[PDB]
Write a protein that binds this DNA or RNA. Sequence first.
RNA 1: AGCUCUGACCGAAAGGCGUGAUGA
RNA 2: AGCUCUGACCGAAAGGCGUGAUGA
Lengths: 363, 363, 121, 121, 227, 227
Amino acid sequence: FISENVRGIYAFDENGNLIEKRYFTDKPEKVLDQLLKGEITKDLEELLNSLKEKGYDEFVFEHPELSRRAKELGFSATTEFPNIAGERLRSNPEEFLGENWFEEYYKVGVALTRMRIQEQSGARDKMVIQAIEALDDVDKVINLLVARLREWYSLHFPELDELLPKHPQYVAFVKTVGHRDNINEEVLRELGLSEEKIKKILEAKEKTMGAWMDQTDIEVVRQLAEEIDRLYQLRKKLEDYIDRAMDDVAPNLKALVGAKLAARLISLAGGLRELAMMPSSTIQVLGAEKALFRHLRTGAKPPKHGVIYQYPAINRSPWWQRGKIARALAGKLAIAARVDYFSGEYIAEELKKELEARIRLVL
Amino acid sequence: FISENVRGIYAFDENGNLIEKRYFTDKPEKVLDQLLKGEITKDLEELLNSLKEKGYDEFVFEHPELSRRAKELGFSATTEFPNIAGERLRSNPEEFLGENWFEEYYKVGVALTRMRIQEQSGARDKMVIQAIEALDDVDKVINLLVARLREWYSLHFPELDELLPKHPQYVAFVKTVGHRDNINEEVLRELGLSEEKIKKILEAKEKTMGAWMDQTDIEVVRQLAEEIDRLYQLRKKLEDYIDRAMDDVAPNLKALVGAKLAARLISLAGGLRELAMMPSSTIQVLGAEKALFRHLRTGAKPPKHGVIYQYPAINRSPWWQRGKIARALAGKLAIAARVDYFSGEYIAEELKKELEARIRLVL
Amino acid sequence: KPSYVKFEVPKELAEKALQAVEIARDTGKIRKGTNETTKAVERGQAKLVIIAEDVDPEEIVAHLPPLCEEKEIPYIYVPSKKELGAAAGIEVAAASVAIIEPGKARDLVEEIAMKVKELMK
Amino acid sequence: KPSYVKFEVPKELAEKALQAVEIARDTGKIRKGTNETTKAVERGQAKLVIIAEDVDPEEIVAHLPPLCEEKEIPYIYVPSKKELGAAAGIEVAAASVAIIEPGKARDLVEEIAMKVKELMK
Amino acid sequence: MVEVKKHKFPGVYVVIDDDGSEKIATKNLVPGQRVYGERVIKWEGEEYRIWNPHRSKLGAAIVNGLKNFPIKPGKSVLYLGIASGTTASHVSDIVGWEGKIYGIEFSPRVLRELVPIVEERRNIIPILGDATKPEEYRALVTKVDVIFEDVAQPTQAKILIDNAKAYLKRGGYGMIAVKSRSIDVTKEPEQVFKEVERELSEYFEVIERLNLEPYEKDHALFVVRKP
Amino acid sequence: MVEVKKHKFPGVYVVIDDDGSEKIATKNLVPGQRVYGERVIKWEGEEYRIWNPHRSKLGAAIVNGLKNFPIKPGKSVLYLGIASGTTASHVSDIVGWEGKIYGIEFSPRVLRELVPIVEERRNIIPILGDATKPEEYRALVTKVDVIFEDVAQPTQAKILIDNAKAYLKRGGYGMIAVKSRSIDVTKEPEQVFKEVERELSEYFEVIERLNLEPYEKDHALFVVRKP
RNA sequence: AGCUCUGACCGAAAGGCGUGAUGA
RNA sequence: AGCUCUGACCGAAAGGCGUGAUGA
C-alpha cells in the first residue's frame, strides 16, 4: 500500500497498481521531516480517508508508527518494511519523477539536511549551559508563583489545596474552571481527574469555608494561572532545545547518559572543553559537593554523591555495590567528551556496550 | 457641539440644531464608562469623520480628555462644560428619548453602576494582601529571568549588556530585533532609543566579540524574552487590580497615601481589621527592619525606618525635620483605617487637609 | 445617640467610674488618652476601659468595643469627654481611658464590672 | 601516524625517556597511568609528561597535548605503550605517564626538555 | 395612641406619638420596605415612616423650623452624597412617582447598600461618582429642579456652584448642609459659615441659613436660589 | 617528475612520483576543488587527486590489492557512514556524473563539513540519519548497485544486511570495513572476523576478506554479493 | 569560609587489570 | 534566636496640646 516520495505520498494497489497519490503542498523537506520519523500529517490523513472512499479497510505502512497512530485514528493498518509501495517507487523512480528524478531527490535531501543541521558555532557548549541553568530558574520561578496562586485562590476555595496536590492540575483548574460555582462533573473530568476525584472535590464545592469572589477578584487570579501555564510551555521548549543542540555538541555524552544529564555534566565543568580536559575522577563525583550541601549549610537527605548517580543503573543497584559502577560510567564519560570535543564521531554505542557488560560482579 | 446621552452620542449645530447622531452599538453601560471617563471610542470617531465629511473642523466636547485626545486624533477641539449640546439634551430629554425617557435614564444608570461596584465580599482585604505580595514575587521572578536573558544573549552580543541597562528595553530588543544582524536604524528607533543610542550600539553590531547563533539558538532566547514581556504585562494588571479594589476596601487609605502603599500597610498588618484595630505608634513604624547599619561591623547607634516614609512629603523633607512628620501621617492613617473598616464614607479630604496644614514648623 | 455604644449607661453609674479614675490615678497608674489606651487593651494591661459618648469623628474610638470583647475586658461610656480628661491627669479632652493597676480604688472598680457584664447582651 | 602527535620524535630521543623513567622510579615518584597522569598535569605536579603513539581510541589521551602547552609542561611520545607500561612499575600497557620528582634521573631529565622546546613549532 | 395629621409641607406628616410628643414622618412610597431600620407606624390604610432628626440633618433642619423647602412632590432633585440612603430615602417618599432623584455617592461600598433599595423604590438612580467632577456624570443626569449637597469636604461650597451651572435649572433652588470643619478645622464656626455664605452669594442668592443644633453640632443648612 | 597512467580499475589511476614510487589517485570531478587537503597533481589538461591509504581505508584496501571493486563509472552507491567526505570524496570521482552516492552521517557536526562540497560536486546527497534505522531515510533514496558501510559500530554486521534488503538490488554487491573491537573488544580479531563472516554469509555470498594492514591496524574489508 | 575521590590487585581456576582493582 | 517607638509640654507671646508635644 503506502510509502512516501521526495515529492509525494503514494498508495499502491495490492498487485502493483497506482491507486492514488497526494503531492506535497508544503516544502517537501518540511513534510518529510514529519513523515520519515513516523509522524502523521494532513497530506497522509487526507489520503487515508480518500482511500476509504474507494473502500479500503486494508492498510500497510513502512514505519511502525505510521501504522500505530493510524489505528489511534480510525484505520486498521499494519507495519511492513520494504513493502509493495516503497518498493515500487525506489525500484523505478523514473516512472514517477521524470527523466531528471535524481536532481530532485538531490535537492529535497540536501535541502532537508540543511534543515536539521545547525550552522557553524563555537559557543553552543555554553548556549546549552545557559538553557540548562535558565530552566533551573524557571523552576524556582514556578514553585513560587504557585505558592501564591495556591493560598490566594484558597481564599475563594480553601479545600482544594490538598485536594489537587499535583501542581499542573491545580493550575489548569483555576485557569479554566475559574470561579467556584463554575465547576461541574463534566468539565471537572476534562482535566485528568479520577471519578473519585470529581467527587472528593465536588462535595467540597457544595459545602465550603470559602469566601466570595466576583467577576473581578477571579479574573486577575485566573490571570496568574494563565501565566504559570505559559512558564510550563517555556520549560518544555527549554528541554526541547537542550535535547537538540546536544546532538550538535556532544552526540556521545548525549547518547550515553542522556541529553539533560549530559548538559548538566557539561554544566558544572565550565564547558565542553573543560570537561574532556579533566580526569574521570574529577567527573564521577561532581554534584557530590552540590548535594552534600544538605548537612551543614541548608539541609536535607543524608548527602548524595555525584551528579551522574542519576544513571538508572547506578540507582536500581544497591549500597555494598553501586560505587564501582560510578567509577566506570565515570570513565566512559570522560572519553565520550574528548571524542565529542574533537571529532563528534558517534562511537557511543561502543563504550555504551563496553560499559554495559562492564563490572559484572560480586554481591 | 458634542455631548453624550444614555442612548447615543449627539453632535449639535452652533445654534440649537441636530446635525447627526450615533446610537450606542454595544451595551450603553459599557460605552459610557469609557466616554464619561474621558476616554474616546469608535462610536465617537465614526461620528467626527462624518462631521468632517459635512465640513466641520470646529470641535467642542464636555470633557477635557475627549478634546485633548481628540487633537491627538487630528481635529482641533476644545473643552467646554455645559456646552450647547449637553444643555440641549439635558434640557428636554423626551425630545430625544420619548415620554418614558426617565425609566431609561434609570436602567442604563442602575446598570452602569452595578458594573462599577464590586460584589459584596469579606475576604477582599486579604485578596489585596496576596495581590500586593503576589506582585513582589513577580518582582523576584523578573530580575531573575532577566539575569538569564542578559548573559545568555550576551554570548551572541556581549556589548549591548551595558548599553541598554534599562531592562524593559533590552528585553524588547531581543524580542523583536532578534538576530544580531536584524538590527537597523529604523527598527532600533521604533524601540525608544535616542539618535545616539541607535549608533552607540549599531557600531558594536558591525564589529563584535560576539559568538554566533542561528535561527534555532535565537528562537529560544527570543522565547525567554516573550515571557519577560508577558510578566511585565502581568505586573500592569496586578497593580491595576490593587488600585481598583482599594476602592472597595480602603477608599481613604488609598486616597491618603496611594493605593499601593495603602495595600502595603494593609499587608504587614494581618489585614484591615488589624490595621484599623491598632495604635498610630504601631503604624508609623511598620516596615521597620532596615533603617541602616553602623554596628553590623563598625559601631554606632540603632534607630528605625518604617514603611510609610515614601510619602513624597516625608521624603523631600530633610534630616533635623522629618520623623515628626511620620508621627502625624501615622495618626491620620489610623483614622483612615477605622472609617475604612466600619463605614466606607469618604472622609479623606478632610484629614488629608487636616494633615497638610498640619505640623508646619520649626527647622 | 452615637452608634458605637452597645448598651445604655445610667448617668451616675458612669459618674462613679468618672471619679473612679479620678482617684484611681493615685498609688496605681491609668494611661490617659486613646492611643495608649488601645495600647493597654491589646497587651491585657487593661482592667476596665472607660470611654466617652461625645467623641467625634465617631469612628476614632468606634474600634474599642470590638477590641475589648475580644480581649475579655469590661468597658464603660462616661457621657462627657471633657470631664474624663480632667478626671485623669489633665484638663484637655480624653476620648477614652482605661486603668492598669487601679491602686486607690482597687475593689472600687469591679462594681462596674458586675454591672457591665449583664447590661451588655 | 596519529594526528594528536604534534612534533616528530626521534626513534632514539624517545627510549632515552622511555628509559629515563625506568630508573626515574627510584627515589622519586612517577604516577603510572593516564588518569593520575592528567591529575598531575592540572596540579603542576608534572615535570615531563611522556605519552605513547599506539593508544587507541586515539581520543583517550588526545587531550594531553593541549593541557600541557597550557600548564606549561614539556611532553614526548615514546612510540610504544606496552614498553611504557613495563618501564614504569608494571607490565600491562601504560598509555602515558609523567614524572613527578625525577629522583634518580634529576638532571638526566631536562635533556629532553631543550629538544622538545625547539622541536615543537 | 398615635395620631397622624398633615404637616405644613407637602409630603410631611406630624405624629402625636405614644405619650404627648411631636415627631415628623413621611409616607412610605413602597409599603413593606424598611431602609435604615426606622420606626414605621400604621394609619388609615397606610404606613408612614418616622423620620428622626438625629439621623437625617434635613430631618433636623425641618424640626428646627426650616422656613422654605423646595423639595416637593413631582420635583426632580440632584442629590450629592446620597450614601446608604437613610437621608435620601425620605425625600423619595416626598418627591413621589413623577418625582425623580439622582443620587451620587463616591465610596462604592456604601452606595452598594443602596442599589437593592432602588428596585422597590424606583424613583432613585444610584450613580457612583465624584461631585468634584460634575462631567463624569454628564450623561446620567437631566437638568434638575433642586440640587442637594451633603458631602463633608472642604471644597463643598464650590462643589454646589459647579453642579449648579451644569444641572440646576434657572430659578430652581438647592440647599447644602455645612459641617464647618469640613472646610476649616482651625478657624471659628460662624466665620467659616459666614465665609461660605459669601462664596455662595457670588453665584446664588442665599435665602437662608439655619443652624442644626441641638441635634448636630456646628453644622448649618443653607438654601440658595439660582438667579 | 610525475607520470600518470591508468590503473586496472575503471576510474583509478597510478602515479610515479618525485622519486621512484607508486601511489594511486583519481580524476578530480570538479577541477579546483580540494576536499580533505590532499595532494592534487596536474596532467594533460586535467587534475588528478592523489589518494592516500592512511586516510581512506578503501584507499588502503586498494593499495593492498583489493581483488574486485564493484564501484565503477555509472554505479549508484549507498554510502553508509560518509563522515567529512574524505572517504567518499574519491568514489565520487570514480562514479562520475551519471553515478549517484547517497551519504549517511549520524553526528550532524561532521556531516555539515560535507554539505558545502556537494554544491559543486552534485552527485553526492548528504543525509542526516541513523543506519540502525534504514526507514528513517526511506524516502530520500532509490535502489543502489553497491552498498558501502564504514561506521565503527557493534551491530555493523547487521547494519549491512538490513540496508541490503531495502535498497541494494539483486546481484548488487556491497563492501563493509570492520574494526573488530567495534564489535567485540575482548575476543580475538581473527575470531570476530570469522563470526562476522558467518553472520553475513547467512544473507550474502562472502566473496572476499582483505586485511587492512599495515595502514590500519586490525581492520579488514569484506566484499559480499546479494543473491 | 569556599574546594580535593583512591592508584595495583580482585579471581579456586579460567586471566581480568592503569584503554582503572578495591576502598570510598 | 524571636520582639516593643515614647506619653505632657513645645511657645517670647499669641495658646497649641492626649481628636498627640518632644524624644527617637
